[PDB]
Amino acid sequence: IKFTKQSSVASTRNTLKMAQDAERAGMNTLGMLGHQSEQLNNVEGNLDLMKV
Amino acid sequence: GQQIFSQALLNANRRGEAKTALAEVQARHQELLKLEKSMAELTQ
Questions:
Q1: Number of C-alpha atoms within 13 angstroms, CB side, residue A38?
Q2: Of residues A5, A8, A15, nearest to B39 (C-beta)
Q3: Using CA atoms, how far apart are residues A44 and B8, in angstroms rounded to an integer?
Q4: t-SNARE coiled-coil homology domain: which residues (chain A)?
Q5: How many whole angstroms separate alpha carbon A13 and alpha carbon A40?
Q6: Percent helix, strand and coil across chain B, each rounded to 5?
Q7: Closest by CA position to B39, among listed A51, A39, A11
Q8: Closest CA relative to residue B43, chosen from A3, A37, A29, A49
């Protein structure tokens, strides 16, 4: 019983670490996507100007 | 002029208490392993 509980503790520790892993990666993805969306907004403006 | 010893029986409730909660902790551990596996895939 004690060994199983210790194994459960270790499992939850790794799960938490990995969950934090997912979170940082996701926040970076959103940041980069906001920056790239904006570069594409700049692209959109020049395409409009070139149309005129 | 005489004396006597004494023996003892455990409580019925106890029963197989070694695994009364061992099965339960093992089942929860299996749940936690499933959780860990899913989190690993999500992080990937």
A1: 6
A2: A15
A3: 88
A4: 2-52
A5: 41
A6: 60, 0, 40
A7: A11
A8: A29
Q: Give resolution, Å, one decimal.
A: 3.7
Joined together, the tokens standing for residue B1 give 């002029």
B26, A4: Cβ pair inside 8 Å?
Answer: yes
How far apart are alpha carbons B13 and A2 in whole angstroms?
A: 21
User: Measured in Å, how far apart are chain B's first and last C-alpha atoms?
Assistant: 81
Q: Which residues of B3-23 are buried (b: 16+ CB within 10 A; e: fewer)?
A: eeeeeeeeeeeeeeeeeeeee
From chain A, pick out residues whose CB is under 8 angstroms from the CB of B42.
Answer: 18-19, 22
Radius of gyration of chain B (CA): 23
Task: State the distance between the two ends of chain A, measured CA to CA, in whole angstroms.
Answer: 76
